[PDB]
Amino acid sequence: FDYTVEQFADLQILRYKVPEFETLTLKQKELVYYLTQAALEGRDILFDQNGKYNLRIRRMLEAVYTNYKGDKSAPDFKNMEVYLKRVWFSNGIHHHYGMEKFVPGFSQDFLKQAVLGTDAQLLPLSEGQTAEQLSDELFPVMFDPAILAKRVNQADGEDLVLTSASNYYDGVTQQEAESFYGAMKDPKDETPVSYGLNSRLVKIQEKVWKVGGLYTQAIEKIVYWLKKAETVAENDAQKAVISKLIQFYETGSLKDFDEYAILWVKDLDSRIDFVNGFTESYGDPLGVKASWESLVNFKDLDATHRTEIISSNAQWFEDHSPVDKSFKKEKVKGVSAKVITAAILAGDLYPATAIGINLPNANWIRAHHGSKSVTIGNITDAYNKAAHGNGFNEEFVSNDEERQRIDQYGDLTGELHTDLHESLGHGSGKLLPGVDPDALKAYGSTIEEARADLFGLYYVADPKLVELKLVPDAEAYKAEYYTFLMNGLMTQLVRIEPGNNIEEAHMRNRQLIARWVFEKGAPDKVVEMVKKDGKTYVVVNDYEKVRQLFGELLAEIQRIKSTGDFEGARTLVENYAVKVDPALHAEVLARYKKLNLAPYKGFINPVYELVTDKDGNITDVTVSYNEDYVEQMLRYSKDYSPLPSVNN
Ligand code: NA
Ligand SMILES: [Zn+2]
């Protein structure tokens, strides 16, 4: 199985497996199939939400690209291909992370001639429009750096509604938009609708995304496949979820959306689950309108059971903690996050995706009905598997014994450390009476993540995990110990710009732990940093002493948090967690850049096929992985692209 697909620009395309899909019942596979069809129909929505020109630009380049009769080896065509591949990845013409508009690496004269050489019937022309007129419209949008420069602008002194290229507002100023929703809100409402979540605000009124409204060509298709899924629901709770979601798309009512989210949160038992709707509001500079996304999934039973083994032993880990007894909870309950297996990704989860989903967003629904927080095990596993043999550990790990141990156990003990951090680490320990939870002020997040990390590091090495059948042998933890220390002392510097220091809380907490252990172990050479041929390597000489030092730092940090010791917190962060050595930074960056590893990853989907008999009865559902990036993007643009090119 090849987890890697291709690499271009600053992007690497991966694939993921869908483990145990074939173990589902046929009726379950059929439900997954329909839900995945409902997911794939939404792609055009996101393109249009990200920019009123995006579908025209995508479709124009697609028509040029697939019908090009010229020299495909020439630099202009190769650069146009890279640009189109970035547009597919980013669901528009802006960087999916940085928000800045792409710079075409090809000439306007080249594109003009390629466009004129394409059959006009294949171009996204409005009725009566010519190819020259389409070019006059779109070329400034693509080529002029001053036009629509940022998809989301967060700069002062500017009308962000007018200086953001996303397409949630049209012909309306920022103050008009902020005031529209400031006035709509009702502060007396204990169960408020999510005002403005599902509409374009235009001139002042809302154009709601719904059947018979804006984007209806795609929403009608989503609803069609959801109605199919409704007929094969696993149980009545899940069926009620699907039925209400259909109603939300048919009416556009935000009260229906709240009703759906309540039913969704109550559907906790079903093997299969999904998201399909206007969900997260990061694409709006005002944080009101939500981009469309979908995910279809089923519970990873083995992985969930493993996290439940950790959760059910919360009290054992608490009792045996190295922290002072006065900081220990007498009764602690562990909460396990379920692990899900993603069957397909779409919209703002595709191709750049998440490793966890925590929904719904409405705080009152979360407070009074609950929530679903899950991690996506097969996406995490694909990230991990794709990295094996990529040259990174070959370049940076001190010796072949470590490289082999990490290759064998690194993925397992890494995920176990995460499970310990997330399911028990933050929940462990208590403050003393009268201590302010905010006593550590700006250092609180760094110290709190260090605390959870140390809890996980201290216990991933415990023989208890062998007894509990979570690790296959007592040596495995050394893989996680080595990579944690290598990352925290040295190799995370690849994320720091030249001349800068450590700023982000997790990066700080990792350097804090590693540098502290390094300092305290130095008289015994517990950890060394050694140079060979001018390259630095982290060398770990006594893993047992590292465990004891992790435990000692855990006790000190627990003390700092539970007593509100701001000066102690500040001393640890400022002395260990911030300063970057310039020589080490440059050395690590030069070694890393030679590896040609792309900084951003995204995934292509598998392909599902419905097998039916003569009379249309389903006889099987198969999943296949033999499609690459170009193929899948073109197939989606051909078969799952129901929106008109202009959505006004
Ligand atoms: Na050694
Ligand atoms: Zn955390």
Author numbering: 24 to 226, 231 to 675
The authors write:
DPP III (EC 3.4.14.4; earlier names: dipeptidyl arylamidase III, dipeptidyl aminopeptidase III) is a cytosolic zinc-metallopeptidase of the M49 family. This exopeptidase catalyses the hydrolysis of the penultimate peptide bond of its oligopeptide substrates with unsubstituted N-termini, thereby sequentially removing N-terminal dipeptides. Despite a low sequence identity (17–21%), the overall structure of BtDPP III is very similar to the previously reported crystal structures of human and yeast DPP III and consists of two domains separated by a wide cleft. The catalytic zinc ion is positioned in the lower part of the upper structural domain, coordinated by His448, His453, and Glu476.
Since we failed to obtain crystals from the purified wild-type protein, we assumed that the heterogeneity introduced by the oxidation of thiol groups had impeded crystallization. Thus, our results suggested that the observed charge heterogeneity in the purified BtDPP III was not caused by the oxidation of a single thiol group, but rather the outcome of oxidative modification of several thiol groups. Therefore, we prepared an additional variant with all five cysteine residues replaced by serine (Cys-null variant). As shown in Fig 1B (lane 11) this variant showed significantly improved homogeneity with one dominant protein form (position 11). Further crystallization screens were prepared using microseeding, and crystals of the Se-Met-labelled Cys-null protein were obtained in four new conditions: JCSG+ C10, E2, G11, and Midas G7. The best diffracting crystal was used for the complete data collection, and the crystal structure was solved using SAD at 1.9 Å resolution. The structure was solved at 2.4 Å resolution using molecular replacement, with the structure of the Cys-null variant as a search model. Both proteins crystallized in space group P3121, with one molecule in the asymmetric unit. By superimposing the wild-type on the Cys-null structures, we confirmed that the replacement of cysteine residues or the incorporation of Se-Met did not change the protein structure (backbone RMSD 0.15 Å). In the crystal structure of the Cys-null variant (open form), one Tris molecule, contained in the storage buffer, was bound to the zinc ion.
